[PDB]
Amino acid sequence: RDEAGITGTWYNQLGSTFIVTAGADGALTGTYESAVGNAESRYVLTGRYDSAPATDGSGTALGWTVAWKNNYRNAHSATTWSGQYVGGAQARINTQWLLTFGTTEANAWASTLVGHDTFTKV
Amino acid sequence: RDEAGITGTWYNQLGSTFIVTAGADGALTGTYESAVGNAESRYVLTGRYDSAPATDGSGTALGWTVAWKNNYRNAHSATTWSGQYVGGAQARINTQWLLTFGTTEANAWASTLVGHDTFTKV
Amino acid sequence: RDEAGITGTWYNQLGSTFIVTAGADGALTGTYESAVGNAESRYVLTGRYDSAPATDGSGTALGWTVAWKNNYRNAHSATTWSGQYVGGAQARINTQWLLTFGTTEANAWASTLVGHDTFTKV
Amino acid sequence: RDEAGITGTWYNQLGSTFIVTAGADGALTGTYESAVGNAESRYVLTGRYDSAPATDGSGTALGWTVAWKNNYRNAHSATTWSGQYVGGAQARINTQWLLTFGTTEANAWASTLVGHDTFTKV
């Protein structure tokens, strides 16, 4: 239902770029490029979305993951975003995210950052 | 590096079952079956992991997503887990998760649950 | 240091109102009135802030809690906000929050909502 | 209702110590000593709890904050815990927490850690 609405290039408030294709079957595949952190260039992402969302004005739930390893750098971390796609003139993906770093067991208390990203098509 | 350690069947403290294959390239693919919530049977999951983790005793960062739609039910929601794989006699995936429900804009404040799951091989 | 900057009336993006006094000693006391949810009128809040923050342009860490019981209603829940005060012409408190509901042990997986609020003086 | 159950000394899985008094009116006051992180000795805490919880076996919602400044150290951070008290032979406070560090605006994306603590009386 939102396959066409989701597919494409999105940008967040940090200036990061998310390029995604939504599959008819609920798949999300693409690339992510972060404007911040221990990252450079594009990184693979994968995820899932609700391909048959409610028809009552609700958003479409979705999520995706990036492991922060590519040919340039390995940040020994992974971020997951969970959120919803809200269609309309000013389409948005509103997300919250969890960034986990690989740690030793003694530091595991301090292993996960939490934040929020809002993506637009502009 | 942890491709063999991750691949297989894992169980969390709720009695949910995660069946995953880790790809050499950082992919995670599989199925999830929740012991709780608006769910039945298996659901597709996808995700990513750090395929070249630090060699200093750190865990391996990873994450994955499930959209809660399959042939039996559609919960109009998606969960992402972010965490790390810790190998050894008692291997564990320690995760935190974010479950987003599709909502209207007025209810979007209340759209995301947060929790934590710990997965073992037993 | 930010005692005067914090003290006063703040409003978030939902239209909620936070009225706080910051003590020289790091205390926060006041009242919260939510524009949404199972709430009416004002509720007690308490919290803490860093009364000697870094002088390098960093924000001032702070947090506070509301238990959602007052003389009108009891929502059997509590929210904590964690964030930072950023002073300047357009002062802001940027927060993330965790709302826990009282649950049975079987439902405890689904006991905590996560979100984010941004408070301004206007 | 749980004023007597909450009041006292609690310990988490890291070996941290939380000493709290619960007031009839919903207040929590006390001290926290962390076994980990940029902390030493005791730090003031304050918080709130549901003083009239549901009678159907549900837990009692509660939260509290610590700003990580005392006479020994100032970590320019604050943690909030949100959770519930579950009474009975093996009483527990099950919490999730948000730790915010003071940051510059450029680093604010990376300002908040998320975790979970479970407190017992032993």
What would the DSSP string read from start to end of D86-102?
A: E-STT-EEEEEEEEEE-
- To which H or E segment does residue B61 belong? strand B60-69
Task: Single out the residue of C46, C73, C49, C77 nearest to residue C61, CA to CA.
Answer: C49
CB of A4 within 8 Å of any CB in chain D? no
Per DSSP (E only), the strands in chain D are: 8-12, 17-22, 27-33, 43-49, 60-69, 74-86, 92-101, 112-120
Planar angle of CA D112, B37, A83, nearest 5 degrees:
40
Give the pair of three-digit tokens for residue B39: 């769910």
CB contact (8 A) between residue A36 and residue D109: yes
- Per the entry, the structure determination technique was X-ray
Give the number of A-C residue pairs with CB atoms closer than 8 Å.
8
Give yes or no for a contact between A30 and A20, defined as CB atoms under 8 angstroms apart: yes
Query: How many other CB atoms are found less than 10 A from the CB of residue D72?
Result: 10
Give yes or no for a contact between D110 and A37, defined as CB atoms under 8 angstroms apart: yes
End-to-end CA gap in chain D: 22
End-to-end CA gap in chain C: 22
Among residues 59-98 of chain C, which lie with CB inside 8 Å of chain B?
Answer: 98
Contacts of B103 (CB under 8 A, 6+ apart): A58, A59, A84, B110, B111
Q: Where are the alpha helices (DSSP H) in chain C?
A: 3-6
Q: Which residues of B touch D114 (CB under 8 A)?
A: 96, 114
Q: Give how far A88 is from chain B: nearest CA, Å.
A: 12
Q: Which residues of C touch D99 (CB under 8 A)?
A: 82
d(Cα D73, Cα D38) in Å, to the nearest integer?
A: 8
d(Cα C3, Cα B88) in Å, to the nearest integer?
A: 50
Give the number of A-D residue pairs with CB atoms closer than 8 Å.
32
Structural domains of chain B, with CATH: 1-122 (2.40.128.30)
3-class secondary structure, A46: strand
CB of B44 within 8 Å of any CB in chain A? yes
Q: Which residues of B touch C111 (CB under 8 A)?
A: 115
- To which H or E segment does residue A3 belong? helix A3-6
CB contact (8 A) between residue C115 and residue B109: yes
Using CA atoms in the order B104, B110, B116, B119, what is the torsion angle rounded to 10 degrees? -20
Within a 13 Å sphere around the CA of B58, how many CA atoms are in the beta-carbon half? 20
Closest A-chain CA to B106: A58
DSSP, res D5 = H
